[PDB]
Design a protein around this ligand. Structure first.
Ligand code: ACP
Ligand code: ACP
Ligand code: BEF
Ligand code: BEF
Ligand code: MG
Ligand code: MG
Ligand code: MG
Ligand code: MG
Lengths: 376, 379
């Protein structure tokens, strides 16, 4: 609502006005929270979560020694600055040793602004560091999508080049028949050649598709979950996503290409992060993701179900039937290739599994991959 | 691991007692023995021991002075006192002075747990690096696999959009070949064959335009933004591969008409080739596993160009293949680690920018690739 949140523990309305006047001269955008006792101070820290505490030493019923001791217990990372008129500088330095972040004397109120600015500058710097890491990650991901598109482009080019020669032959033979440049008997021969060139195009593509494409082996389900956790923890941290796990079922193995199963799961996670960042551009308590594994039984067969539930935008009903189609994306093409869900569905079927989803618009989306357990 | 243990001890008899306890444990260590301050000081600097075991009372030298020096020169090296000169009440105090552990000579059985804990802490640090390296390798393996998967999906989609007209061509051709149609229907069917062949060409053109035309107009970009982004992306690459990366020159304040993302793709492609060449030549840590990254302004044919240069000292490029690199799908790496597309895409991108991509290499010594892009200057 308001950028900074400042907690003032102060009993003098006159001194509060003096302190605030110095901050307002700087056009600092802060939300003031004023408290004069231990209950208000204790409640305001927990419920309001201030980014900075400014405390008086002497309040009726409350003291800055107790306030500092409470702050070190409840909000250790929050900067705490004393601003008091009850002692000199000799006494004030000692308070820093007690773990105050800074100390401002009321008779030297000009010192308040540098103390506040340093604390705010340090807070911004911490935010700036996380942001630079997020931007670096996004740039790395854009380059990776671009390298993927170039390889697709090279494959489209090579297949077009090997096909155009027989395609030309088809057009010349058809043109000779259509032009009437051939007797009835040559037209049958040319029509035979057209069939052979059409069969050639189908074979060239088959040899190419086989060139562009390991055996399944038993893999422990737990090995997959540890790898998925290990890969996505940093993604959630960079995106400030809260990640919850509800259940696991290791000690069951599946016949899979482990790398391809992890590829499915990673694609769903990427869809969840994009959905979450679109709904919650800043930090929000509802920017959460649920990751679960479970054993499911279907048609008297047991399956390992991997589930990824995000609380982002959900999938609008008009597009929900069209989401596994190749190249379908609602993101601007610069950020979305539309290949994630279609590749994951292809891989899932190759493993004898299924990929399905449930979503309620504006609430959640849950994608789940089921793969049959290998029982020897 | 071949640990290196520095022993500051003046009694050869007590040294044999200490070493005998470690040798019973089959601890693989290299002993370094010193009895004075000069030998102790040199051994820390020159040999870089992984553990220091020190006596308190050596003639001409003392463990208080040893601790103070160790804290100045090798603060992170574990330091365990092993002395016969005092009791446990005095020994506990030595830990407060920053000894890692204290072993009494009369209780030499306590030496092994102190050493094992110190070695385990070193191993744990090595284990952490290994787990991070393995995680990074798996992420790169998954990304390479996804690139191969995308190529397969594009090959599949073009086959699906083409097969419908291919079926029609084959059916129409079959009716003509059987003679089941008069001469006028055969000409009409031949026209349909022509129309379906043109359709296949159009389907392919629309697919190729999505794969090679969603690129963007050229815009002026400042050279320095490209260099900072390249630095930020490759810092982690060099750290994971234990590559020493040096920059010889930069030339910001010059701009080029480019697709910034495509320029970074060239440079990143050259970097990946350097890392692979370097990893093939130096599988372990080596001081010559170095990379030189430079930018400069170059003049060619009375035109000024921004040159980005990447020089690795890895596996030189053999003369027989030097003439063939940059060809589409040419790779000497296995399929698990190479598609052969990096240099061919980079040469295309360089030409689309009015630039060139070139290289110099001496076999067994170094390779230098350099990308030239024209400076944007209306004047
Ligand atoms: N968790 C999620 N939340 C909201 N929408 C989602 C979603 N997962 C998928 N979608 C929708 O389905 C579409 C299909 O996405 P898909 O993964 O197939 O391609 P993509 O647009 O995500 C780029 P990429 O192929 O690189 O993953 C998305 O563009 C989006 O509109
Ligand atoms: N710095 C370098 N040192 C040694 N050989 C190099 C090299 N740069 C390129 N090469 C050689 O040229 C080949 C072409 O590399 P290119 O990048 O085009 O495809 P690639 O083999 O590296 C797999 P990818 O297409 O995924 O990058 C390499 O496989 C390698 O044999
Ligand atoms: F009451 Be306070 F210490 F200014
Ligand atoms: F001489 Be030592 F300190 F055992
Ligand atoms: Mg007061
Ligand atoms: Mg996706
Ligand atoms: Mg001695
Ligand atoms: Mg390469």
């Amino acid at each position: 609502m308001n950028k900074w949140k400042f907690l003032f523990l102060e009993d003098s309305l006159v001194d509060l006005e003096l302190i605030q006047r110095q901050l307002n001269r700087a056009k600092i955008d802060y939300y003031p929270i004023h408290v004069s006792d231990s209950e208000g101070f204790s409640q305001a820290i927990l419920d309001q979560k201030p980014h900075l505490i400014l405390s008086d030493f002497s309040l009726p019923k409350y003291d800055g020694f107790s306030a500092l001791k409470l702050a070190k217990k409840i909000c250790p990372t929050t900067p705490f600055i004393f601003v008091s008129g009850t002692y000199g500088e000799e006494a004030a330095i000692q308070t820093l040793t007690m773990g105050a972040t800074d100390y401002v004397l009321k008779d030297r109120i000009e010192k308040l602004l540098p103390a506040v600015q340093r604390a705010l500058h340090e807070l911004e710097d911490h935010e700036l560091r996380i942001k630079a890491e997020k931007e670096r990650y996004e740039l790395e991901e854009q380059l990776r999508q671009s390298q993927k598109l170039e390889a697709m482009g090279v494959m489209a080019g090579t297949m077009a080049h090997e096909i155009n020669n027989p395609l030309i032959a088809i057009s010349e033979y058809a043109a000779m028949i259509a032009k009437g440049e051939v007797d009835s008997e040559k037209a049958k021969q040319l029509a035979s050649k057209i069939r052979d060139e059409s069969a050639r195009i189908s074979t060239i593509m088959k040899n190419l598709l086989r060139f562009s494409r390991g055996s399944l082996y038993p893999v422990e389900v737990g090995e997959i979950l540890v790898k998925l956790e290990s890969i996505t923890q940093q993604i959630f941290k960079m995106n400030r996503i809260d990640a919850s796990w509800k259940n696991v079922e290791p000690g069951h193995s599946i016949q899979c290409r482990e790398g391809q199963i992890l590829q499915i799961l990673l694609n769903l996670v990427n869809n969840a992060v994009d959905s979450l960042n679109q709904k919650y551009p800043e930090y929000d308590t509802e920017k959460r993701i649920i990751l679960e594994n479970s054993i499911v039984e279907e048609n008297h067969k047991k399956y390992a179900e991997f589930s990824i539930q995000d609380f982002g935008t959900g999938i609008p009903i008009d597009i929900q039937k069209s989401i596994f189609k190749t190249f379908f994306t609602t993101k601007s093409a610069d950020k979305g290739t539309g290949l994630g869900l279609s590749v994951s569905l292809g891989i899932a079927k190759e493993h004898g599994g299924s990929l399905n989803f449930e979503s309620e618009p504006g609430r959640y989306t849950r994608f789940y991959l089921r793969v049959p357990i290998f029982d020897p």
